[model samples]
Target: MKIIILGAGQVGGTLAENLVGENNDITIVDNNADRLRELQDKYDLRVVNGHASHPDVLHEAGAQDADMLVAVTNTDETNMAACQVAFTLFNTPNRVARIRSPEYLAEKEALFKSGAIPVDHLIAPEELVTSYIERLIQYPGALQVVSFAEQKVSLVAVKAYYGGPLVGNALSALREHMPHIDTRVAAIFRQGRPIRPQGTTIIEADDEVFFVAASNHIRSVMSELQRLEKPYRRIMIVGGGNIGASLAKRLEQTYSVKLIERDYQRAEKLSEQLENTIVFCGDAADQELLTEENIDQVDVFIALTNEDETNIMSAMLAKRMGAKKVMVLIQRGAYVDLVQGGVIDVAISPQQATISALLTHVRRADIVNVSSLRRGAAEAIEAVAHGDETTSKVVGRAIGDIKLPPGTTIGAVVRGEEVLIAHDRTVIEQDDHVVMFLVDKKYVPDVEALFQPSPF
Candidate 1:
């Protein structure tokens, strides 16, 4: 596949890195020559230095023969205009734009029509991160929560704690523990090493356990691995940015929410916009403000400030100050591994969420959803099975009969309203959405090819 990516920021640069190794022709365009040069130095792809939306820039970036055009420049208007230009001038088959503003998304149906902006897909990083955080909050004990098959199935990652029911138990014990509820232990990581789960494999304390189950049975499965946390009520957010503000709006109705912003004007606006949330104009790192807010009683403290240093400091302080769980939105990928699982309960990355959304569109075959797990080390994908026994590799084959890549496990199959946990004898039929977990991502192409229909 040949692709032109507008902007050389984190999203575009990361996208280039993922696509280049897969035999795709990737060209990244940016106004800053230094940024373009930096990306070109690291990755094997072409870089064009110019305004992203300019036609000459697109042409220079090989937009004419590109299979897809991805506009992810920081500015919403620039991304929109670039998609329009790609569609109008180069007739790019797929135009994806990273639209941040809710105004454009509010009118997405009407605004992105064929005669309008011509954006085939919209990737909103803030919205994606917000929802990602919301899911973690909803499932209090989970380290990560991702949905598939339109919410029919969910893949949840949880750390097994000492004294948990399933800790030190064989993988086969899960079925015996919950006979009525069917679930699959897709993969397990012990000491940062992937361990292909088998019936005899034992789950140990501190092991990162990834399991797939029907949406309704997620809580029951989670309880078997770790002590179920009490539902969250009081939430504190530090940053009045898009992610923080939107999260506060979403959680205020059900949870007692407080938002702290350094900028007084933004805090004042947030105070007016949110009905139940308490907006404070003060530095989130202030010890006095946290004490006054009774941070000890807070169920969740989320630091979403743009500055990595501030988020790290505030969240660590909150954890020390007795907040039950602390989470930080860290932009730097390196910081995620450093802080996660220590004082920080979870590290949220907008880049990972954005990459996952973009990959859903970039992926071959009939893949509908893609999620990066363990910070790109693993992946969970939802792909549709097409064609009949003769034309398709996966369709009309039992889970055990299909040749799946190593470390990749078929977790569940969703057909219409029915959700079936993958078993050896479970057969994949046409139109079934197959949810899979790849402990290793190098097999992504193999998985894609396995699902693609053969030529007639």
Candidate 2:
């Protein structure tokens, strides 16, 4: 597929890197010649250096023949206008823009429809990050939560603690613990190495377990495998930026949310903007302030301040000082893996979350959702099967009959309003919302191919 990506920032660059491996023809556009050159040097793709929103620039970036136009430039207006230009002049088949303003998102369909900007899709980094954090808070102790099948099914990842009922117990024991609940252990990682899960496989303490089950049954299954944490009530966020403000705005009504902003003026601004949240005008790292605020009693402490060093340091300090759970926003890709395994409860990558939305558009099959898990080592895809037995490879095939790529599992299928767990004899039907999991993401493309409708 020929793709033109606007903006060479973290999100665009990461998308390019991930898509390039899938053999897509990717062209990156940015005003920064150095950034474009860096991307050119690193990947097998074209780079356009100029005003990303300019018509001449878009033309030079091959928007005319491009399969899709991804406008994620820094300026919201630029991204919106770029899509308009792509729609008007080039007739680009698909246009995706990164629209940050909540005001714009509120009227999304009206604004992005035909005869208007017509942006096929929109990605908001701050909103994505905020929703990610909200899910973590909703399911305490879960490192990641990826919902599928209209929230009927969920894939959750959690570390195995010694206190958990299933720790040091074989996987087969889970059936005895909750025989009525339908749950499947998607994969297990021990000491950073993949352990193909089986009935006899014992879950050692510290192992990372990935499981899928009905959304309502998630908490029960989690309790059996790992100690379930009480739902969070007090959430303290540090940073007055987009994410911090957005989270405090959303969670304030439900939880005891306190926001700390370094700038006094910004704190005052947020104080006026928020009704339920308590705004503090002080440095988040101030030891005296944290102690006075009762950090020990805070159920969730989040360091969303800019800079790699500050977020990690403050999160670590909160955890050490007895915060029940600590989460930090790490923009740096390398730092995410480094800190998440230790002190921090969750490591968030805005780029990582944003790319999944873009990926849904890139895959060949009819997809409703795509989520990356295990720090990008695995992925869960919720997609629809098209055509019939003679025209599609998926529909009318039994779970065991489909030629799935190795390391991929057919987790569950959602048919209309009913949810059915995948079984060897279960046959896929047309338009079935099949939720598939790939433990080893290297086979993602092959799995995608199997779901593609056959021309026959």
Candidate 3:
């Protein structure tokens, strides 16, 4: 696909880098000549240095012949204007924009339809990051959350801690404990790609467990895993940027929240905006400041500072200071492994979140339902089961039993509002919606093999 991206910031740059490997013809536009030069040097793509909101700039970026036009500039106005130009002047088939202002989201559809803007998708990184953090707090054990059809079917990832419930238990034994639940183990990740667990496969400590279940039954599954913890009350947030401020506003209504900001002006501004939350001007990296604020009294500590290293370090410090849960926002995906190995309980990257949102929009045309999980290491794919599709491929069939490539697991099946935790005995029928959690990067080919009229 030929795509034009307006912006050379972290999200746009990262998306261009990923899409280039997929063989897409990518063109990036930014006003900063140095940034464009850097992007051109780093990736196999064309970079145009010009005002993204200008018609001439869009044409120069090949927006007229592009399959998709993505506006990801830092300013919501610039993004919206660029998207409008792409739709009206270039007639781009698909248009997506990054909109940060929460006010604009109120009348999103109206705004899109009125301005010759085919704004098919709108991404708010702050909202996306906050939602993920809230889900992590709600489902403490989930490494990732993949939802389908208003969450009719859901996939959740969990890691086994030492001496935790289900440790040293076999897959079948664990199933026996929750005989009435319509959930499935789906896949297990040990040292490499996840595999379909066998009856004899033991749930070892430290192994990552992925479960598929009805969205409503998620709590029950977490309870069985002994991952259900008491609700968090007090929260401490490091950084008073947009993400931090947004999170503080949302959390303050229900939970006690303290927001720490290094910039005195921003801190003062946030203090006025948040009625129920305390805003403090202090360096988040300073242990003394955190201790002075009684960080130990907080149930959850969140690091939302701009610097990834600082966020990670602050989260670790909070964890060491006896905070029950710590979350850090890191922009670079490459640092995920380090955060996972560290004391942080949740690691969020704005770039990854934005890319995932964009990928969801891109895949909507081919897959109807899809979600990237584990930072794009895996995906949860859903398709309506057709009549000619083999039942053997659906139920009672181990993923390996099918001629599927490595790293794919048929996670769950949904029929008439019933969600089946997949088993080898599970069968696919016409009209049944099937959800597959795939670890291998070969998504398009695997999906094509499962459905008719191959997407690739």
Which one is best on TM-score?
A: 1
In model 3, which runs have C-alpha deviations exceeding 4 angstroms?
A: 1-67, 73-75, 102-110, 113-118, 148-150, 189-196, 368-370, 375-377, 383-401, 453-456
lDDT of 2 by residue, 1-456 (tens): 788999989878977876774447999999988898888887899998898878899999988898888887888999999988888888988888988887888777787754487688888877988998987787788877765425677778888887676587887777576554667777676665666666788999877777876767778867665457788988999998888999998899899999899999889999999999999999978988999999999999999987768888999999989998899998865456557767787788776677766766665433434555534465676767778888888889898899987777777888876778777799999988888776676776676577667765
lDDT of 1 at 114: 47
Best by lDDT: 1
lDDT of 3 at 403: 53
lDDT of each: 0.82, 0.79, 0.74
RMSD of each: 3.0, 3.2, 4.2
Clashes of each: 0, 0, 8
**Candidate no. 3 TM-score:** 0.83
lDDT tens digits by residue: candidate 1, 179-250 = 545578877777666787888999988787778867777788766645468899899999998889999999
> What TM-score would each prediction reach against the true structure?
0.88, 0.87, 0.83
lDDT of 3: 0.74
Candidate 2 residue-pair clash tally:
0
lDDT over C-alpha atoms for residue 139 of model 2: 79
